[PDB]
Structures are given as structure tokens and as C-alpha cells.
Protein: o-glcnacase nagj
Amino acid sequence: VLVPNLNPTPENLEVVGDGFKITSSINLVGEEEADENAVNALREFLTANNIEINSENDPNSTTLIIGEVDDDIPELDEALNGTTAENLKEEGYALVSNDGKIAIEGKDGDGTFYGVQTFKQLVKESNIPEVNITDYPTVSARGIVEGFYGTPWTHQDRLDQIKFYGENKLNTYIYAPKDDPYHREKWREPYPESEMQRMQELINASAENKVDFVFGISPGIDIRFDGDAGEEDFNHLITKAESLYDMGVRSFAIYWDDIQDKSAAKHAQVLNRFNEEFVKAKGDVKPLITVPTEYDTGAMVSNGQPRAYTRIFAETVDPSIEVMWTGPGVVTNEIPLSDAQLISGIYNRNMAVWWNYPVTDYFKGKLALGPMHGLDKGLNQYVDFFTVNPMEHAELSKISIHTAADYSWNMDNYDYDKAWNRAIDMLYGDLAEDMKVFANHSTRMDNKTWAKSGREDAPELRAKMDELWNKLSSKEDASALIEELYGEFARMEEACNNLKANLPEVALEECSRQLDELITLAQGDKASLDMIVAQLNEDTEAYESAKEIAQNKLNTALSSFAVISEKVAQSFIQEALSFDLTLI
Ligand SMILES: CN(NO)C(=O)N[C@@H]1[C@@H](O)[C@H](O)[C@@H](CO)O[C@H]1O
Structure:
């Protein structure tokens, strides 16, 4: 009957019937013409959900038809009747479920694979709704940049991330981690055989999930530009890129972010000569990607005009090259349309975004568990390439990455609160509501100086706390609000205790300290109410005992590595301790 949570939100979806049961043995049609990676993902889900494939057609089993446009499959034509992927952009597809048949038609092999992902999300206990779908991404490249400092993701983490990207229609992975010397301090050197297996698994997994594996190269550390030395180094760039191409890498990025030699013309000439002698000469290599030394608006622009570096770079760099920038700041609240307009005009092209959220490398005590927030819903006019920099914490990064998938696939309809809820619903199952309680307090990032981003922590709770102070200072009866807040604080503690008891270890290991912090803070919040209530009752002894606890709970939180709800659960105790009800 009803449609399950879907991610990304499909572009067009119509519920056209009451739904039906998928038979435990089905008819598979198109299995030989259709995209292999889509079929494998299909076979993989079918196996996992206890569904067998009929070796011969129809004891009136359910029929599943799969393939691409212009694929020679009439069964597909018939099941779709009226709806089609023919007029859809790259990566687009059509899905029709109706009266014992499911049709999956992609505009290309990527689209077929993505149709299979929607299919997998539509099925619940072998029931599927009857729908007509036509779907396609808002933005052409969507994904992750592995750009964070701190403990690296492991091999298994990366394999898991790649699968997750595929499942949420993210097609871009910029492999450029700090712990692989072959991407920076050993950039000249091809990978030795002792490393080829590990690299190949990543490349293979990526391909198989329709994820573009971008090899990030940072030659800035020691690259030479002039004379024989500069020629030798340019030749090493080629040989490196070839040797990766030989492994099946078809996407490359060259970073200029950490170079001392701030020479725009030298940077851009290397790019252009690489574009020509490598990217153009191979023919199946995707557009070149670069990060210029000036890569946030503040570094790039002064008084509406490009600074010298940016101006030279914009003027030299080939128009075919993708150029990354991080928005108005390195870590900032927003990218408004005007910022993307300004930078895109300077570079006379659609821009690539490197979004520094949920990354927490600059403020590691806190977990960034909120949605894409602050990004202009019209950014696609000036941007056709979107990536996020996630946390060293791979598992909990999925919450925010999940919302980036929705934002970049269906930008016009993105709603950060709804996407945030959906991400936690789809990821946490029976723990979703408890995980929301916790994550809600840990969305806002702010190092107090240059780095700030994300949705405010617990906005509703924060508004209730404000009303408490307003009522108490106005000598209005606050009895009912106090009871309500006791409810909120008990809920925070209970949720956090259930997460400690029941979160799978893969998630718990990333957040155990922050859970303990929020519990401490919730207990200090409760003691803070006890303080106020004592003052209302003129019970000096009850006031002193509540105050001692509130202060010790605050102090435990302030001294701990873990950071959470600074402006909300934490600040409330400080507000309560500075409040003097005896003088109102
Ligand atoms: C675009 N870019 N360098 O290529 C980038 O964002 N670099 C780092 C980025 O790697 C880091 O995670 C972030 C927060 O500390 O700071 C930035 O300066």
C-alpha cells in the first residue's frame, strides 16, 4: 500500500493503485541486455530478501523487467505504458509498478542502477506500492571528498562508504586521504604491487556502485615548475596518472591548496598541459578537477574583484576544468546564491563545491549530526558539482551525507528538517526516535573564531528555555513550563541511556563520550529546575543542594573532551546559575 521513506526524494512520483505482493519466485526479464551493475545489485537484494528467480516464465509469478532505453526489450515497453526515460537527463530512469509487474528503464546504465536503488527502497516485507516514477539528479556530480584531518577511515570504512553512496545515488568519491603518501609526499611514485590490491578493491567497488573514483593528487609539497626540473616533474605527473589509469582510474583532481609557490600561472599551466597531454589524449577520462590555492570567497575576492592569484588562475585555467571552492568561508553558515553567482562569474563556468560539513577536524570533541543547512536551494544555476567533507567518524557521517544525497539529487524540494528526520528513520530503525533526541543536540559547529556551520542545536528546546526566563522575570506562573522541561530533560537522559544500551558498536564507538556528556548535561538541567523550584518555594536548603549538583554537572561537562549542545543544554545551567529569582 503506502510508500516507504525514499532517499533521494524521486523527481516525479505518482501512486496509481493499492499495491500488491511480490511473489517469492519471480519472472526476471531483460537480465542480459540491462546494465550488469544494476542487475548484480538486483540479484543481491533478491537473494537477501528470500526471493528466487524463475528459470522459466510465469506460474503467474510477479514479473520484473529491467533495461535501458533503445534496449531491445518489448516487455519493458509494455509494462511502462505511457511513462518513459527517453526524455530524461544522464543518470535518469523510469520506474513503474502495476498489477503484478515492475518495470525499470534507465536512460543509461547509471539510471538503470539508480532505478534498482529506488526499487529496493520501495519493497517492504515483499509488498510494493503501485507507482509511476520518472527520476534524475538536479546536480551532475554528487558525493564525498575524503579531505578531513585526524584518524583516517580504514579500508573497510571506505568499502562500506562506497556501497552507501551507491544506495543513495551519490556518484562521486574523491580519494585524497592524508594517510596515503602516494597522493602527496610520494606523489611522483606509482603504486607498488604491495598496494595494488587495496587500491583496486576501492576502484572496483566504486565502478560497481556507479561511483566515480577520483584520484586526488597534491604535488604542492615539492613540485618544481621551471627548466629541466619542472619538465621532469611534469613528466612524473603523466607517468603517475597513466599508472593509475592502468588500474582503471578515469577521474583525477590536482590540488594547489597547500603549495608555498603561490604562482597562479604555473598552477594553471600544469593543469592545461595535463588536460591536453593526458585527459584529452585518453578520451575516456572525465573532466579535470582542481583546488586553487585561494578556494573560499574570502581568500579569492577583495571588494567584489578577484585577488591577483584568483584573477590570473581564472584567466588561464581551461574552461573544461572543474574548479572547487568552499563557499564564503572555509567553514561558514551558508552558500547564498549571490556567493556562487560571484565566484561562477569570475571563473565564467559552473563551479564545484567542497562543503566543509560534517567535517569536525577543527573541533573534534563535537559530532556534526545535522542536515545540509545554509545551502541555497537554487545553487544548481551556478554549481554542477557538489561534495561534502565528512568526519573521521565514518558511521555517524552517514546522517549528514544522507541529507546531502537528497539535496544534490532533488534540490528544489529539499527540506532540511524533513531530510534530517528521514535520514535518521532510514538509518537507525527502531532506535530512530532515540537517535533523534541525541543528534538534535549536536548539529551546530562553532569553534568560536573562524569556523561555524550547521543548523542550531535543539531549536524548540532552546525556545522553551527562553520562554522560561521570560515568564520568571515577568513574575508569570511558570509551573506548567517547568513540568514540561522536566519532561524534556528526563527524555534526553532516557534516550541517551537506551542508545548506550542498544546502539550497534559501529555507531556507539564513535559517540560514547558525547552520549555521556548529554546525560551529564540533562542531569544538570534537571538540577537547575530544582534550584528555580526551590527559590519559588523559598526552600534555601533545597536551593543549595540543587545548586551544588547543577554546578558540578556543568563543571564535569566543561572539563570533558566531549562537546554537545553548548548553547542549549549546557548554557541553560549557566543561565539558571546566573538567575536570581529572589530579586524578581
Ligand atoms: C578545499 N580545501 N583544501 O583543498 C580544504 O577545505 N581544506 C581544509 C579541509 O581539509 C579541512 O577539513 C577544513 C576544516 O579544518 O579546513 C580546510 O582548510
Notes: The chain is about 45% helix and 15% strand. The chain has three domains: 1-136, 138-453, 454-583.
